[PDB]
Design a protein around this ligand. Sequence first.
Ligand code: HEC
Ligand code: HEC
Lengths: 125, 125
Amino acid sequence: QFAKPEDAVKYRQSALTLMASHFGRMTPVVKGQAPYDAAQIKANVEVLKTLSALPWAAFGPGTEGGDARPEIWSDAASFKQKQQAFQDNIVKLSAAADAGDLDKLRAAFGDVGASCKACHDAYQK
Amino acid sequence: QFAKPEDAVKYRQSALTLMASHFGRMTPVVKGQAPYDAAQIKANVEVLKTLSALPWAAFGPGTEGGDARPEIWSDAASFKQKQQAFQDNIVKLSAAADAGDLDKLRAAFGDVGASCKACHDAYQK
Ligand code: HEC
Ligand code: HEC
């Protein structure tokens, strides 16, 4: 869907920005600093679910650039495992949000955040 | 969800970028230049649906900035009608995509695009 490789870079950065907002905005809720409204969080995690599937198709072949480390493409398969692991952790977060259980949400949220960091540590400059 | 007003600006620009990609990538399909796969389009329009609800909450009070014209806030209510009209046109597009009818998709797509332009004409610098 990208006319030039920089279009893919702009798309993925935008997706990751939105992901970060939908993930990070829950931090005060998981910490108990903002109230826990189960319906609010369920809705938000549904948006995060959708968003969290979007960046990976914009690291296609030939889309080298941005703050991506070249190893996204030089070890594409390690990168792929890290995206699928992250998405699997999003499934656990969705289940916790659908259950309406703050303890489960806290645990899942930490799992998701660890998965973000693991990919950054290897693939972000 | 924004620590400072510029955070809202970055969020909305990112949402609108993603919206534009999910909308514009269908152009060759509606023009007949790329094949029409009803399941492909149905899935894509579901993503566009989700995305199309996201920018408006990031034009909150006090989030003046970006390439937004000041009138988004000085006539907030005209801006609001234009967002709700755009979202209503997204509903028609979703219905066309769910029906799997290329003629209906073409008509809805044109309706949506006209709604994008109508808002830009009044509110984008
Ligand atoms: C499987 C790999 C991977 C996962 C998982 C991942 N990221 Fe990243 N992230 C990247 C890469 C690669 C970049 C740099 C992209 C670029 O500049 O081309 C990035 C960039 C970003 C950016 C900056 C985008 C910009 O505007 O330039 C943010 C914000 C971000 N990530 C947040 C997150 C959050 C929050 C999570 C987890 C909820 C997450 N990421 C999970 C790989 C990942
Ligand atoms: C109800 C108003 C409204 C509608 C509807 C709307 N836009 Fe916009 N658009 C804006 C405003 C306001 C900006 C500038 C936002 C800013 O810079 O703060 C903008 C900016 C953009 C940008 C640039 C974002 C960036 O990276 O800075 C793109 C791309 C875009 N719009 C595409 C679209 C498409 C495609 C549609 C329809 C599918 C659409 N817009 C519908 C109001 C709207």
